[PDB]
Structure formats: structure tokens, C-alpha cells
Design a protein around this ligand. Structure first.
Ligand SMILES: Nc1ncnc2c1ncn2[C@@H]1O[C@H](COP(=O)(O)OP(=O)(O)O)[C@@H](O)[C@H]1O
Ligand SMILES: Nc1ncnc2c1ncn2[C@@H]1O[C@H](COP(=O)(O)OP(=O)(O)O)[C@@H](O)[C@H]1O
Ligand SMILES: CCN(CC)C(=O)c1c(NC(=O)c2cccs2)sc2c1CCCC2
Ligand SMILES: CCN(CC)C(=O)c1c(NC(=O)c2cccs2)sc2c1CCCC2
Ligand SMILES: [Mg+2]
Ligand SMILES: [Mg+2]
Lengths: 331, 331
């Protein structure tokens, strides 16, 4: 029983909250690894709720800090031939996409590789090539972007098909924890200099999905997968194989219709309560990610939260959800 | 007085259409200012419908060609201190947004100033500074982005309000075919190096509008306005004060609920048939743009069309609509 890693990241105030002089109800203490939320009362007398997690990232945490602390170790595990999954979980508006993908610094200040606002996906793709540049491990990188909306499956990277084209899912006869998704494009990323244009094609498909499907960016779940096939050659000419897969999952907004979100919650509850039956098959998302929930994949959850008093109830909901998830045991 | 000038722009075939060896049902003859549509069957015998416009631009037409032939003369009129409007009209998918805004060339190949895929808005803003930072002109540039969705008004540039906040409109007691939009932000663009980040904020707010409102990019109407206040002192020391405004309007898609689109059509019909009553007040769009529709503003329409046989009926509908509009007299 190796526990799932669960971390918390609080977003900073936006311009509007700044000009309204907003006070944070969230204090994160990184060294105590604690998040403390003011739940009522006043200045000189108050109620709070405090939570301990594996790591906590306050409103001022930069993208590089998150990448170095959480992702760098996981990418090392992937390169060793393990499968790893990182979920982002929290209410719409708290920074799941910011964390997982990032944004461009304004006014074309930086190239993509150096942009301090880059998130997990671009940083990860850049660093694989760097880590494996001349260590004797030959490798290939392939990426896919499978998304779930109203329990239908979409491919956000395939250049032939329109986004509206549903994919079909089947059990894998060879892997009984596994599925096969008919139609899903795997794009080979040949070098660092192919990364950005591949991601641009996905961003373009994201805009069309939003035009076509109501609140697509909030209600959809996205699974960005990167698979690294590796071959080492020993001094005696024998070849050594490993395959590492990283799933980077940007969940639908948690705020309180979404069968996959509901089933994820039920799967987590089943696993933490150690009920024998765990309802993976009750949604697409949980069938796809079966191995990341009490399976042989190394899993982390980045729980995203708001500093704003406006968001107190959903913030507490997120923390309680993430804090319960700590008790999931993966092998 | 000045009839509205109407130009046609046919988009080129895309990747998929080229893959499927599509043959164009449109032939554009710019010297003759004509577009010819194959309306029945064959490439060896065929019925055709033809239309003559103020200008016609075929599939080969690039953004720079549109800029030099259409935008330059209009911007020169704006800089002389006059008001001008350019509408884009046509079915979703035919290049309204491409024409008015443009896109980025992939893989960070260009800066925004030099990107060949830049449309009217960025080219205009760049050129205002280029032209006037030259001569003996003291000038200020303000922009606003007012958008209409389901007869509600949104400000898509305001960096410190969320898009969801609707604006109110009222008649302007001083200006007769004029309105006041309470809360609409005019952003000062101090120099060329402030242009892109202002547009990026708009891009960002566009994304949130699409999440919040169904089919936003297709059903919304957007009015991007640029106002230039100029104090020109001539070589001879004379000081001329002028005010120029340019409205760049990206209309909701015309394809077969949208009160402003319906009212625009009915307004054009009344103007062409010279019905004494012209129904401006029946929608927000036509009240906001009343001076551009049989008023004192110099107005042009760019009708966008498809070369694909799939789109024949909508293409014909667009051409007929646009061709009617030629008869509208402005002052
Ligand atoms: N760590 C952060 N630093 C700066 N801005 C952030 C951060 N996290 C989120 N944001 C901002 O908050 C808003 C919501 O972030 P987003 O990634 O869209 O949230 P979600 O995907 O959870 O809805 C965006 O405007 C984004 O720029
Ligand atoms: N003149 C053009 N040249 C190249 N591509 C174009 C042109 N016009 C439209 N397109 C392409 O067609 C698709 C739809 O264009 P878009 O601007 O979104 O149309 P609309 O705004 O009318 O829906 C886009 O992929 C765009 O790049
Ligand atoms: C900023 C526009 N971009 C970034 C290309 C994105 O859309 C994007 C990503 N962003 C990035 O790659 C970066 C942001 C800042 C520097 S790189 S990751 C990703 C997308 C869209 C779909 C696939 C996952
Ligand atoms: C490419 C992302 N961008 C371009 C910033 C756009 O959104 C954009 C425009 N595009 C541009 O400014 C360019 C395209 C290519 C070179 S510059 S004009 C405009 C927008 C969004 C809202 C206001 C009107
Ligand atoms: Mg998001
Ligand atoms: Mg458009």
C-alpha cells in the first residue's frame, strides 16, 4: 500500500479582486505542509479548518516551483519504465488548466521553451529530450489527447477528422485492466522543435469543441498522454527495454450530470473504504484510468483552490475531497 | 453621397478538401469584379449564376492583398477625420474572423507585426502608429470591443470585469443616430508595443465567453472600434484637430432567434426598397450601428464565401444578400 500523492495549489488574486482589496481566507504553510482556511468569525476572533497534504503551494508559487517539486520526480519514474498519472481537481476558475498547460506571457516576451507561465505538459515534453539527450538510451515519444464530454470520446490531436467525431472504446483482450480506443491518434514527437506546433493543433481543436459543445472547457475531462519507448544497449550488446507512460488529466470542474466525475468520486470512496466492488466500469473516465485508481500506476492529485471568501464552500469541498484521496493505496 | 461598397472574398480549400480532391464551384474574376457559381451539375456542361460586386477576391487572395486594396484606402479616410465601418458577413466557416482578425502562423515563426496571416484589426493598429508616429501628428488611440449575444451586450476588452457582466444602452440626447453604452471601456493604446497584450486580453475573454454562452463564436456579433484623436501640425505650422473612428464588425454567421441578425436584414431591405420606416430600433446591433447603415459613415461589407459544392445554397444566399446591399446610399 503506497499512498497516492496529494498536493494543494492556491491561485493568486486576479486584477478585479486586487482593486476590490480582497483578503485571502487561505494560508498555506509549505514547511508544515499545511493549508488553513478561515471559515467564519472576524479579525480578532475566528474559526479555521487546517489540512495536511504531501505538499502545499501558496498563491505566489511559480510554474517552475510546481514542476520541480512535483513533476520532476514523476518524470524520472516514467523514464525508469513506470506509468504515472497526474490529476488536476478543483472548481472551475482555480487553475487546473493553468497548472496542467499554462499560458503565454503577454506581448510575445518569451519563446515557448522559456516562458515562465508554461505548465506541466509543455515543460514535460521539453525535459524528456533534455534528460535523454546523450545517456545511451534510444527513445521515441508519442502523445495523444483523449477527451470526454457527456460520456462521449473525442480526439483533440487528429488532423484528418473533425473534433465532433466520437471515438469508440473497447476492452483490451490482451490487458484486462486496459482498453483500446478505436481512432485515437498517437503523434510522434521527433524532437523538442516539433512540440509547440503539435500543441497548437490541439489548441485549435479545443476552440472548435467549445463552439460545438456547451461549456466544453468546464464539463470535459482531458487526458494528455505521453508514452516513451526506451532501449538501452549494455556493454555486451544486449538490449534493454522499458516503456513509460504519463497521463496528465485535467478533470471537469468540481463545483456543485457528469457521469465520469460522479463515478470518479464513487471509485475513490470505494477504494478508501476498501469496499470489494469498485465501480470502474460505470464511466468512460474510470474505465480509461482504471490503473491510476488503486492499480499499478503511480498517481498524484493536484487539488486546486481559490483564495477568495466567495469560494469558501467549494474550497472546503475540494480540500475534503483531496484529503480523503490521500488514503488510496497504489502498487 | 457614396453607395456602400461590397466586396466578395472566397476562402481557399483546406487540407481535407484538398485530400478529397474537391473541385471549386466558384470562379472569381477580379478584373471584371465578378463571381461565377456553378449551380447545377457538370464541369463539361453547366448552368451558372454570376454576380458583379465592387470588388471580388478569389481563393488565392492573401491578407496583404486585402490590406492594400481595401483597408488602406479606408484607414486613410479615417485618418482624414471621417468615420468608416467594415462588416464581415457570411456563413460560419468561410473566413469572417480570419479576414477581420487573422491567425498566427504556426510554430512562433513570426512576430505579430509581421505575421502574413494577420487580419484587418492588427494590421490597422500597427499602421496607425507607423503612419502617425511618422509625420507631424500628435495623436491618441482608444479601442473598445463591444459584443452582442442573444441581445445582451458584453465588453470583451475590460481587463478588470468578467465578460458575464452585461452592459446597458440608452439613446444619446446630443447625437441623433447615436447611443450611449454605459460601462463600455475604451482602452488607450499608448504605442505599438501595447497593441498585442490588449488584443490578448480580448482573446482570453473570448474564451471565457465561449465557455459561458452556447456557440458564442458563431452566434455573437462583435464591434471592434478604433478612435483616433489627432492634432496635426503641418510643415507650415498650421494645427489641424481631427477625430477619426473605424468600426470593424464580425457579424454572427448567416447560415440557416438572432434578433440583431434578423433586424440587420430587414434594415437593409428597407434601405434598398426605400421604405420610409427603417427598423433600426428593433435590435441592439442596428441601434449601435445606425450611422453605418444609410447614415454619414463610409461603409463597406466583405462577404465571405466557400468554394465547396457542399456550401452551394449558403453561398448563393450570401451572394444574393450582399448584392442587394450594393444599393444602400450613405453620406
Ligand atoms: N497560479 C496562477 N497564477 C496566475 N494566474 C492563475 C494561476 N492559476 C490560475 N490562474 C488564473 O485564474 C484563471 C482561471 O485559471 P484556469 O486555469 O482557467 O482555471 P480552471 O482550469 O480550474 O478553470 C485564469 O485567468 C488564470 O490565468
Ligand atoms: N482566406 C483564407 N485563407 C486561408 N484559410 C482561411 C481563409 N478563410 C478562412 N480560412 C480557414 O477556414 C476556417 C474557418 O475560418 P473562420 O475565420 O473561423 O471563419 P468564420 O469566422 O466565418 O467562421 C479556418 O480554419 C480558417 O483558417
Ligand atoms: C498558449 C496556447 N496553448 C499553449 C500552445 C495551449 O493551448 C496549450 C499548451 N501550452 C503550452 O504548451 C504553453 C504555454 C506556455 C508556454 S508553452 S499545453 C496544451 C495546450 C492546448 C491543448 C494541448 C495541451
Ligand atoms: C491569435 C490570438 N489573437 C490574436 C491576439 C486574437 O485573438 C486577436 C487578433 N489577432 C491578431 O491580433 C493577430 C493575428 C495574427 C497576427 S496578429 S485581433 C483580435 C483578437 C482577439 C480579440 C480582439 C480582436
Ligand atoms: Mg480549465
Ligand atoms: Mg468567426
Amino acid at each position: 500500500g503506497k499512498n497516492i500523492q496529494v498536493v494543494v495549489r492556491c491561485r493568486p488574486f486576479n486584477l478585479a479582486e486586487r482593486k476590490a482589496s480582497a483578503h485571502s481566507i487561505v494560508e498555506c504553510d509549505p514547511v508544515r505542509k499545511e493549508v488553513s482556511v478561515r471559515t467564519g468569525g472576524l479579525a480578532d476572533k475566528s474559526s479555521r479548518k487546517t489540512y495536511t497534504f504531501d505538499m502545499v503551494f501558496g498563491a505566489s508559487t511559480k510554474q517552475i516551483d510546481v514542476y520541480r517539486s512535483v513533476v520532476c520526480p514523476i518524470l524520472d519514474e516514467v523514464i525508469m519504465g513506470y506509468n504515472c498519472t497526474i490529476f488536476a481537481y478543483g472548481q472551475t476558475g482555480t487553475g487546473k488548466t493553468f497548472t496542467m498547460e499554462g499560458e503565454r506571457s503577454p506581448n510575445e516576451e518569451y519563446t515557448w521553451e522559456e516562458d515562465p507561465l508554461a505548465g506541466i505538459i509543455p515543460r514535460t515534453l521539453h525535459q524528456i529530450f533534455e534528460k535523454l539527450t546523450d545517456n545511451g538510451t534510444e527513445f521515441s515519444v508519442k502523445v495523444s489527447l483523449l477527451e470526454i464530454y457527456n460520456e462521449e470520446l473525442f480526439d483533440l490531436l487528429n488532423p484528418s477528422s473533425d473534433v465532433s467525431e466520437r471515438l469508440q472504446m473497447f476492452d483490451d483482450p490482451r490487458n484486462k485492466r486496459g482498453v483500446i480506443i478505436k481512432g485515437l491518434e498517437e503523434i510522434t514527437v521527433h524532437n523538442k522543435d516539433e512540440v509547440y506546433q503539435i500543441l497548437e493543433k490541439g489548441a485549435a481543436k479545443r476552440t472548435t469543441a467549445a463552439t460545438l459543445m456547451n461549456a466544453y472547457s468546464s464539463r470535459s475531462h482531458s487526458v494528455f498522454s505521453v508514452t516513451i519507448h526506451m532501449k538501452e544497449t549494455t556493454i555486451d550488446g544486449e538490449e534493454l527495454v522499458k516503456i513509460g507512460k504519463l497521463n496528465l488529466v485535467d478533470l471537469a470542474g468540481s463545483e456543485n450530470i457528469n457521469q465520469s466525475l460522479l463515478t470518479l468520486g464513487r471509485v475513490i470512496t470505494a477504494l478508501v473504504e476498501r469496499t470489494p466492488h469498485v465501480p470502474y466500469r460505470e464511466s468512460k473516465l474510470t474505465r480509461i484510468l482504471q490503473d491510476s485508481l488503486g492499480g499499478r500506476t503511480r498517481t498524484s492529485i493536484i487539488a486546486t483552490i481559490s483564495p477568495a471568501s466567495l469560494n469558501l464552500e467549494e474550497t472546503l469541498s475540494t480540500l475534503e475531497y483531496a484529503h480523503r484521496a490521500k488514503n488510496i493505496l497504489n502498487k
